[PDB]
């Protein structure tokens, strides 16, 4: 009968720690979803910028030749 009372004291402790973790875990997952969205977004722009400078330098090289 006494053990029936003690066993309950440990149950509530694990339930709260699990809920508290789930609360932050979901928040981190949501945050990650937002960050990863901008990550690939910036990566796409970075790749685009890299493509631009490559074409610019190529054209500039031609302009220099024609200038001379």
């Amino acid at each position: 009968a006494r053990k029936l009372v003690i066993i309950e004291s440990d149950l509530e402790r694990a339930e709260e720690r699990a809920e508290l973790s789930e609360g932050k875990c979901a928040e981190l997952e949501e945050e990650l979803k937002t960050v990863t969205n901008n990550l690939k977004s910036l990566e796409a722009q970075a790749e685009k910028y890299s493509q631009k400078e490559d074409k610019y330098e190529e054209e500039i090289k031609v302009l220099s030749d024609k200038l001379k």
């Binding site: 796409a44 790749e47 493509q51 074409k55």
Partner: protein, 375 residues
């Protein structure tokens, strides 16, 4: 809505069924043009399966479905299943009766004559349409982007069409049709995927290939220089966790398949690249009419969304093309809905009255009314 009466806009292809309400600028309820039955016999009792599984309901659960596509670029494998695709369009999503509002459909350039009369039979005789027209794919987008003088190459998953429309349509041929887009790229992957312990076997999961494709796969600027780069495992492989659970490190797989676009020699077709066919259409027109065509090039469609699609064109064109004036390609950052934005245009025009087919007009000129007035 105490404004006018009877109006609507629509557009279908080999990807999505673009449609909306009256007088809209953008679509409202797009959905995949799919339709299948049950290879699983749908708990036969947990409903008399039927409804092939079309619409969001179909796209949601793919497993039970044997996605058998009806209209593969031009050819319609079967019309009987088309019956319950439009029955899902006007009545479920659009929430309007086709026996009231007109309809503006799209026309796959150079579509079989027998098909036009067959379609009209489904609308006028069954769905009772007192007004409708089927405009020609590309020409629509021209008036949207705000161009009157350019060459249009509108294509996504359906069929490639080089339409030099900058001052006249329906004239010399100067147009091409190529069954090499969308589903062609969707079916080719599983083949080459076999060498990497992967194989999207059936058609159901084949549809997913397209989903992942449009989020990472890119085009190589120069296959030669990127061949040695393969050693550098950095710009190639990228961790993509399959929703279920099976990582796929796509790298060289990304720029290998798209190469087929410019090189149709990888699938047994003598069809020249999209930049050669461009010449074929330009060389037909007058000599003193090219300098303005190069100035502006209308590249539209969801196929023109992948990384490295416009810059490559400016490399191959200049080679076998006049080199004196400046050359610029106009590829609307969102050039997929170019047809729909143009659809909204013709949908609000009154001059359009001298194009569509009125209820009585069909009975006064038989079934050939279509090819008797239109063109």
């Amino acid at each position: 809505d105490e404004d006018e009466t009877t109006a609507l806009v629509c557009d279908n292809g080999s990807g999505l069924v673009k449609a909306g309400f009256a007088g809209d600028d953008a679509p409202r309820a797009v959905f995949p043009s799919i339709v299948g039955r049950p290879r699983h016999q749908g708990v036969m009792v947990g409903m008399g399966q039927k409804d092939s599984y079309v619409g969001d309901e179909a796209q949601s659960k793919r497993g039970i479905l044997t996605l058998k596509y009806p209209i593969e670029h031009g050819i319609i494998t079967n019309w009987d299943d088309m019956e319950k695709i439009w029955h899902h369009t006007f009545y479920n999503e659009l929430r309007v009766a086709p026996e009231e509002h007109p309809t503006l459909l799209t026309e796959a350039p150079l579509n079989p004559k027998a098909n036009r009369e067959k379609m009209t039979q489904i609308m006028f005789e069954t769905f009772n349409v007192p007004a409708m027209y089927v405009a020609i794919q590309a020409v629509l987008s021209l008036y949207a982007s705000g161009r009157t003088t350019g060459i249009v190459l509108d294509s996504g998953d359906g069929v490639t069409h080089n339409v030099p429309i900058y001052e006249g349509y329906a004239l010399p041929h100067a147009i091409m049709r190529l069954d090499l887009a969308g589903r062609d790229l969707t079916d080719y992957l599983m083949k080459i995927l076999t060498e990497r312990g992967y194989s999207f076997v059936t058609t159901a999961e084949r549809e997913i290939v397209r989903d992942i494709k449009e989020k990472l796969c890119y085009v190589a600027l120069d296959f030669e220089n990127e061949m040695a780069t393969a050693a550098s495992s950095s710009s190639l492989e990228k961790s993509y966790e399959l929703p279920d659970g099976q990582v796929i490190t796509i790298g060289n797989e990304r720029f290998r398949c798209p190469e087929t676009l410019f090189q149709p020699s990888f699938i047994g077709m003598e069809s020249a690249g999209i930049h050669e066919t461009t010449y074929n259409s330009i060389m037909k027109c007058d000599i003193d009419i090219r300098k303005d065509l190069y100035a502006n090039n209308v590249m539209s469609g969801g196929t023109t969304m992948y990384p490295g699609i416009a810059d490559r064109m400016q490399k191959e064109i200049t080679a076998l093309a006049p080199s004196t004036m400046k050359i610029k390609i106009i590829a609307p950052p969102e050039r997929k809905y170019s047809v729909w934005i143009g659809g909204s245009i013709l949908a609000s025009l009154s001059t359009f009255q001298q194009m569509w087919i009125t209820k009585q007009e069909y009975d006064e000129a038989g079934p050939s009314i279509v090819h008797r007035k239109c063109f």
